[PDB]
Amino acid sequence: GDRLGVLTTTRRVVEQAQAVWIDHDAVAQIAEAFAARQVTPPTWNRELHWSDGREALANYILVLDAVNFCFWGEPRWRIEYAGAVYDGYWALAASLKRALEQGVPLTDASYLAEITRDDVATIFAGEGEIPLLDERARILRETGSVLAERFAGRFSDAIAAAGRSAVALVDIVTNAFPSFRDVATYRGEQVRFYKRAQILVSDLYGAFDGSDLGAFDDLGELTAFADYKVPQVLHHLGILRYAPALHDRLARREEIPAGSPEEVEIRAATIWGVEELRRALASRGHALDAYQVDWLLWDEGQRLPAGTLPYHRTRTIFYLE
Numbered sequence: 001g002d003r004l005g006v007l008t009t010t011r012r013v014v015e016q017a018q019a020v021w022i023d024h025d026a027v028a029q030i031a032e033a034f035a036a037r038q039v040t041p042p043t044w045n046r047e048l049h050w051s052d053g054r055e056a057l058a059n060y061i062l063v064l065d066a067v068n069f070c071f072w073g074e075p076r077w078r079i080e081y082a083g084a085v086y087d088g089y090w091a092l093a094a095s096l097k098r099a100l101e102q103g104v105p106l107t108d109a110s111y112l113a114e115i116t117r118d119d120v121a122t123i124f125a126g127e128g129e130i131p132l133l134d135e136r137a138r139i140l141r142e143t144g145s146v147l148a149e150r151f152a153g154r155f156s157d158a159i160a161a162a163g164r165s166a167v168a169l170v171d172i173v174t175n176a177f178p179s180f181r182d183v184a185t186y187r188g189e190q191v192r193f194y195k196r197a198q199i200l201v202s203d204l205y206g207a208f209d210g211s212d213l214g215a216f217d218d219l220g221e222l223t224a225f226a227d228y229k230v231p232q233v234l235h236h237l238g239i240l241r242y243a244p245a246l247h248d249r250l251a252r253r254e255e256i257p258a259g260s261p262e263e264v265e266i267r268a269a270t271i272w273g274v275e276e277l278r279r280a281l282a283s284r285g286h287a288l289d290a291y292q293v294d295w296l297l298w299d300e301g302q303r304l305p306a307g308t309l310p311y312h313r314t315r316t317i318f319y320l321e
């Protein structure tokens with residue numbers, strides 16, 4: 001069933017986990033409510049996402065998801081675009097569209113391979129500064145050179161080699177692009193997540209409306225994308241519970257080291273939180289794919305009540321690259 005081993009490896013963490021557990025009573029109740037009013041994920045957002053030709057849109061999706069991480073910090077990083085102030089993901093998406101409309105060639109492997117610290121400090125210019133600026137530059141350079149060297153500057157070539165398999169395409173991405181390699185260990189066992197590689201596949205589906213390069217026959221094989229907003233929504237809905245030390249650490253906005261048992265438990269329990277909710281919805285005759293349940297919860301996250309427990313703060317590491 002699980003050809004990437006996200007569900008298999010995360011399942012071992014959820015079974016042994018000390019600081020996080022699922023409230024299956026709360027899963028049942030949220031499923032009852034969601035299935036009753038037949039909730040849908042939002043439509044892949046056309047306004048803040050770029051669109052273009054086949055070849056350029058494919059490379060744009062790769063660039064977008066290559067740097068799709070870690071937006072928290074003080075002072076909050078914000079962007080002005082089309083007379084609106086944005087933060088977090090929508091800041092990332094706006095900053096890229098803004099740069100593209102002013103004809104910065106971010107879709108071009110040659111430009112990316114070469115891109116300087118100051119080129120990307122400009123693209124993400126606003127209140128404060130995007131976290132891990134230097135790292136995003138390194139990742140975009142890595143993305144360009146791999147595109148240029150292995151795929152003739154066209155992500156379309158990678159996508160064609162996947163033969164409409166979402167799972168095949170994740171594996172091709174992690175194999176070729178080092179910075180998409182999202183694995184950890186728990187009590188000496190490897191745990192596999194592949195957040196940005198899996199987001200990338202769902203974003204192609206969204207961008208191309210499940211046609212051409214966005215066509216995939218096995219989207220059901222995707223899991224949830226183990227980020228920091230979705231577990232915040234599952235804690236808010238009562239589905240994820242946190243033990244005392246972790247509850248206090250999140251409340252005080254203390255940072256959690258990447259790959260620490262607490263961070264890996266939050267992420268593994270996010271994967272199974274979304275999975276057990278998908279099962280319970282299906283049981284109640286509302287059959288969604290795990291990525292759709294993710295999109296739907298991520299959307300809830302964009303309008304949580306002020307004074308819900310803060311999201312966990314992990315500074316994303318690329319030590320090995």
Ligand SMILES: Nc1nc2c(c(CN[C@H]3C=C[C@H](O)[C@@H]3O)cn2[C@@H]2O[C@H](COP(=O)(O)O)[C@@H](O)[C@H]2O)c(=O)[nH]1
Nearest residue numbers: 068069070071088089090225227228229230294295298
């Ligand atoms: N699990 C999951 N995580 C997601 C997304 C998205 C954007 N996807 C779009 C495509 C289809 C959907 O309907 C969305 O419109 C961003 N993130 C993560 O969020 C965090 C920033 O959060 P804030 O500060 O609140 O913007 C950061 O870790 C980023 O990686 C998602 O879909 N699922």
Ligand SMILES: [N+]
Nearest residue numbers: 229298301302
């Ligand atoms: N969110």
